Amino acid sequence: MSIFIGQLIGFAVIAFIIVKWVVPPVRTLMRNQQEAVRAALAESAEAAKK
Amino acid sequence: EAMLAKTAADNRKSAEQVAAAQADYEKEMAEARAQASALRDEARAAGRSVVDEKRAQASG
């Protein structure tokens, strides 16, 4: 139980670190890829229109 | 990947093909103009021949 509390606190610290300093850049990368592919699709559509 | 390559080719081909259509329009215009000029030239040459012939006959 005591070690369970210790490891739970450790996991809370790990999750805080991840959300603070790891989630933001990864979310940015995912949004960047999604925007890039969306722009590629839209540019293909306008090329077909042209 | 095929979509992106085809889109780049689409932009290139559309631009060059618009230019080609305009050039073909101008080519047809030039050909028709040359045909018209040739008709007028040969018509006036035939007229000149007719006038020369009939003047020569009148003189004779």
From Swiss-Prot, chain A:
Q: Which residues cross the membrane?
A: 3-23
| Intracellular or extracellular location(s) | Cell membrane
Miscellaneous information on this protein: Binds 2-aminothiazole antibiotics, which are antitubercular agents.
Q: What does this protein do?
A: F(1)F(0) ATP synthase produces ATP from ADP in the presence of a proton or sodium gradient. F-type ATPases consist of two structural domains, F(1) containing the extramembraneous catalytic core and F(0) containing the membrane proton channel, linked together by a central stalk and a peripheral stalk. During catalysis, ATP synthesis in the catalytic domain of F(1) is coupled via a rotary mechanism of the central stalk subunits to proton translocation.
- Describe the family membership recorded for this protein in Swiss-Prot or TrEMBL: In the N-terminal section; belongs to the ATPase B chain family. In the C-terminal section; belongs to the ATPase delta chain family.
Assembly and oligomerization: F-type ATPases have 2 components, F(1) - the catalytic core - and F(0) - the membrane proton channel. F(1) has five subunits: alpha(3), beta(3), gamma(1), delta(1), epsilon(1). F(0) has three main subunits: a(1), b(2) and c(10-14). The alpha and beta chains form an alternating ring which encloses part of the gamma chain. F(1) is attached to F(0) by a central stalk formed by the gamma and epsilon chains, while a peripheral stalk is formed by the delta and b chains.
Q: What is this protein called?
A: ATP synthase subunit b-delta
Q: Which organism is it from?
A: Mycolicibacterium smegmatis (strain ATCC 700084 / mc(2)155) (Mycobacterium smegmatis)
Q: Which gene encodes it?
A: atpFH
Q: Which residues of the full protein are shown?
A: 1 to 50 of 445
UniProtKB/Swiss-Prot annotation, chain B:
Cystine bridges: none
Coiled-coil spans are none
Subcellular location as annotated: Cell membrane
Q: What does this protein do?
A: F(1)F(0) ATP synthase produces ATP from ADP in the presence of a proton or sodium gradient. F-type ATPases consist of two structural domains, F(1) containing the extramembraneous catalytic core and F(0) containing the membrane proton channel, linked together by a central stalk and a peripheral stalk. During catalysis, ATP synthesis in the catalytic domain of F(1) is coupled via a rotary mechanism of the central stalk subunits to proton translocation.
Q: How does this protein assemble?
A: F-type ATPases have 2 components, F(1) - the catalytic core - and F(0) - the membrane proton channel. F(1) has five subunits: alpha(3), beta(3), gamma(1), delta(1), epsilon(1). F(0) has three main subunits: a(1), b(2) and c(10-14). The alpha and beta chains form an alternating ring which encloses part of the gamma chain. F(1) is attached to F(0) by a central stalk formed by the gamma and epsilon chains, while a peripheral stalk is formed by the delta and b chains.
Family of this protein: Belongs to the ATPase B chain family.
Q: What is this protein called?
A: ATP synthase subunit b
